[PDB]
Amino acid sequence: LTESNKKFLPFQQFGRDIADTTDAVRDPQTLEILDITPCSFGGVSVITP
Amino acid sequence: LTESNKKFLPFQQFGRDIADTTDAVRDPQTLEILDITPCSFGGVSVITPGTNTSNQVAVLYQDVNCNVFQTRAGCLIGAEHVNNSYECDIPIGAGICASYQTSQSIIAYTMSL
Amino acid sequence: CSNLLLQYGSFCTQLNRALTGIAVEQDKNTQEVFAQVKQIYKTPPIKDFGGFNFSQILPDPSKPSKRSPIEDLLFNKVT
Amino acid sequence: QCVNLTTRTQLPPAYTNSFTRGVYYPDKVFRSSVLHSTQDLFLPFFS
Amino acid sequence: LGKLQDVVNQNAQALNTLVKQLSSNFGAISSVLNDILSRLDPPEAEVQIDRLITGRLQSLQTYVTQQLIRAAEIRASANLAATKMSECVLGQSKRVDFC
Amino acid sequence: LGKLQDVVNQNAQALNTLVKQLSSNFGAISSVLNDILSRLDPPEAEVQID
Amino acid sequence: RLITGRLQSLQTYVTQQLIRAAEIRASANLAATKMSECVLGQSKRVDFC
Amino acid sequence: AQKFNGLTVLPPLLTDEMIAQYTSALLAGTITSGWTFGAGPALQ
């Protein structure tokens, strides 16, 4: 939940993106706009001599 | 139910084709052979002159038989046919295109090779 | 989903191998296209080629990218 | 309590044409720089 | 530029379609697999998860085939470009209407 | 010779992948159809066979 | 199951048509090169025209 | 035919008359100019 720089209109609780994924939800008790990002993923590549 | 020109043997009621579709049936009332043809269908197409050039569009039919010009690639409406030929830019098919030329309106003409 | 995925992990292996082959093929394409020569030739400091102006295709030292203005325009034109 | 009115000469209603009216927010989400299409009750244009 | 734009737009729209395929139930009662697991009984829940996996596996194969065809086309174009480079750039080509 | 070895290995691995795919159940209760035929009646085991 | 089978048949037909179209593109490129070289001039490539 | 089941065919952009005209023009160019018309203006 990172700190965003985009404000929300005072009637919205959700938020989506171009790819239609919920990645911005407003916290209800202090009215902060927080982004949603997946933690991490990847693959274990190895180099062999 | 069109009028056929082929007769059936006097023991049959149905009739199929190469593609195995029932397209001929004898009428039991007067022993009349009638063809079966599927009802018309297709897809509409839009001819656009482009952004910041015009606003009006033309509607093109693929294989539906019918200001209005009957092309070899279906039915074209909204584009006036003109006998002269220029170099075309928007392809349609069967050797005829559409273009926006002088007010100014969308016209259809045979291509110039 | 993983407990049901062992019935199609072989298809998953096939698609992963196909994607890996596609990636290594596109990696090899750049080697077969641009790596024609193995010696890097520096442009001469003398620009007098008998009157031929080559500044539009040769890199310029005015910009840090060192990309030719034609190449920079090509980069800026396509998204 | 309510009272009744009296008959009088009135005017028949007229018909007018709308011009880009009857558009509202179909949801309560935030959408920026996207073109999203939704199926919801709206007012027709040029009706 | 036309040739350089289609190779990016087709990949972007294929990725968008792959994203959108997860929003369909494929004939089941829900799109997300968590709701059926957290709402229905364990014995019955195994026939909706199977439908979801079959639908997504069917979705994941057409994209692979399309990418393989696109990669073959890109290989053909890259071979043509390499030959054109080696002939017209790396010397003078006598082939008329080739460079 | 990289290319000939690569194509031979690819063909062999594809055929072996098909052979090992024959050993998969695809979400059913067994892989071989003979076990399902011997253990379950054909009217009931039609969906698994399909 | 009818929709799934018809979709499978349509996808198989689409893949076959795409492979045929790729082969047609290769043949058309070969024909275009032949028209550019052997027809639109004299080609020095031996055993090509 | 093969169009009764929604399998409509698309007519070609170039009719056979136009391809015949293109081939005749190429033949006339290659018998009256050789290779000059294929790499610039036509020279008799």
Ligand SMILES: *[C@@H]1O[C@H](CO)[C@@H](O[C@@H]2O[C@H](CO)[C@@H](O)[C@H](O)[C@H]2NC(C)=O)[C@H](O)[C@H]1NC(C)=O
């Ligand atoms: C080669 O061409 C470039 C064009 O980019 C010339 O650069 C221009 O030169 C004129 C003359 O002073 C200037 O007014 C322009 O501002 C220059 N443009 C750029 C982008 O630099 C260059 O002078 C030419 N060189 C020769 C030797 O002819």
Ligand SMILES: *[C@@H]1O[C@H](CO)[C@@H](O)[C@H](O)[C@H]1NC(C)=O
């Ligand atoms: C939520 O309520 C608390 C008190 O219950 C209040 O202090 C706080 O400001 C409220 N948050 C808002 C209004 O965003």
Ligand SMILES: *[C@@H]1O[C@H](CO)[C@@H](O)[C@H](O)[C@H]1NC(C)=O
């Ligand atoms: C289209 O229909 C009209 C009237 O129904 C008919 O006269 C005309 O011949 C038809 N066109 C074709 C190509 O059959």
Ligand SMILES: *[C@@H]1O[C@H](CO)[C@@H](O)[C@H](O)[C@H]1NC(C)=O
């Ligand atoms: C075009 O000119 C020819 C010349 O004879 C004429 O027959 C034809 O009717 C003209 N078409 C239109 C649409 O004016």
